[PDB]
Symmetry: C2
Subunit: 305 residues, 2 copies
């Protein structure tokens, strides 16, 4: 037993990480088949990032200007193109370590693992959630751009995020692997409002179920509630409204524990209105929203890859 | 910027994980060079674990009774021996994916990454600390035994933990890779007292420095303290006593931030005596002790492998 904020094993992604250098800028690329993907801002100088004309900047570059190194092996670049905010560098060798993979655009409130990298070399791995406002709260230093987020199902890596920028607020923004930003963000060094964020209610409920499964149950009570009543409380506390689709996704956890979803909502209602009373749940003194229902089922059932 | 509880990239360890079956029991093994390491309790039935005679049980087994599979390839077992609480199965093929590695016995209060595995297949990765009382608070289900803990420095994997058992309290115990348990624990299904635990003070202080580096600084104050005075408070709150060796290890973080260690101790003293006042630090509502000073330096400087 026990419940930890676990990331997927990162080896299948580690084998895809490369370094990309254009001019004086170095960041990370992702090498899959005979294409390397990376943020298009690799082509900017520090002066360009205030309002770059990416089309004009890219025109001044040729294939031989993109230096791509996988470990200590240099790749030969035979074409380049910009797709939204990503560059795609065609190379003459397919990556022998390419895993089965796909590109997915994830929904807010879903989770994924990030492999943080610098100069093409992996540094560490951690799990996180796409916030309702399409930012992530990661750990990204200068040179981490191009690090990717992913999920793994069976033998297939679903790539969902590439890191592009740190907002002045210290939160992080990036794109899917087609180069479309999540959220309203653009790849230029300007102040950019992130929307109002909310707490991911269905994830909090999943984590409360995870707690009960593991023996933390002091928060269970004699009360119940209704979807309407609970959503009045969710609104007061800046939680996402709960829908029947959310209740349905929680069905397997409700069945396993025997705790009806609306009964668990009444536990959550009381925790929101009264706090935790100096107590903890699964080692946390606040309500955790970075585990999805699937994450809970997966971890408590021991799925592997 | 940003600060996350990051694990090392796990790919170098993933390539070493195998399944070991003896009789009806299946768990995980670690394949390095031409040796597979796994918990010796693979040779027990469910009835044996109350007080197994491991010497007698092992005598009834021969090389061909240990079924070892790396992915879908079967390994040929050419010898077996017990070292403390681990079995070492010599196989006729050296693992082509063996990383540069060493075996280390870590000290309480140090951290490491765990690759949780089932049936030889990796499931997830997470970071954790060896508690002062030589237990770990992990995520381990039935079949996870033989999963390993490790650190990586440059290109060298230092293996430090193999998982053996869940105590009736729900905390976890295991061995170094020579099969010596951390703590007083034995590999038999009996109630076993874990010692009194404490909070790892030097790690809390490191994390407070990490917070200041990242912009969380509301807890800094106008006070200072002495090692003696702070240790009176540490004793009241069940924190490890702080020593000059600990102060010395915190030197680089003190230099970077300009905050003298004893000044940060005065911040910690106030947090212990007064709580967090409904506030958070690096996304946490309690004082975090699972980051060492080295972990903080590493993450804030972007070291890679």
């Amino acid at each position: 037993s026990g419940f930890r904020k676990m990331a997927f094993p990162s080896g299948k992604v580690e084998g895809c990480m490369v370094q990309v250098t254009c001019g004086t800028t170095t960041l990370n690329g992702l090498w899959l088949d005979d294409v390397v993907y990376c943020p298009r801002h690799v082509i900017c100088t520090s002066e360009d990032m205030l309002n770059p004309n990416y089309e004009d900047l890219l025109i001044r570059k040729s294939n031989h200007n993109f230096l791509v190194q996988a470990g200590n092996v240099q790749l030969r670049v035979i074409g380049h193109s910009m797709q939204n905010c990503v560059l795609k560098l065609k190379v003459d060798t397919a990556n022998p370590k390419t895993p089965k993979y796909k590109f997915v655009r994830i929904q807010p409130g879903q989770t994924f693992s990030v492999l943080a990298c610098y100069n093409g070399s992996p540094s560490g791995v951690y799990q996180c959630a796409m916030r309702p406002n399409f930012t992530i709260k990661g750990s990204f230093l200068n040179g981490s751009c191009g690090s990717v987020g992913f999920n793994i199902d069976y033998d297939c890596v679903s790539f969902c995020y590439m890191h592009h920028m740190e907002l002045p607020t210290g939160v992080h923004a990036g794109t899917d692997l087609e180069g479309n930003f999540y959220g309203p963000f653009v790849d230029r060094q300007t102040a950019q409002a992130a929307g109002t964020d909310t707490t991911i209610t269905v994830n909090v409920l999943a984590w409360l179920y995870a707690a009960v499964i593991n023996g933390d149950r002091w928060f269970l009570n004699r009360f119940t509630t209704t979807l309407n009543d609970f959503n009045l409380v969710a609104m007061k506390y800046n939680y996402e409204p709960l829908t029947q689709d959310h209740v349905d996704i929680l069905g397997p956890l409700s069945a396993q524990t025997g705790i009806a979803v609306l009964d668990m909502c009444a536990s959550l209602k009381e925790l929101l209105q009264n706090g935790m009373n100096g107590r903890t749940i699964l080692g946390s003194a606040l309500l955790e929203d970075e585990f999805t229902p699937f994450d809970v089922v997966r971890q408590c059932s021991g799925v592997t890859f």
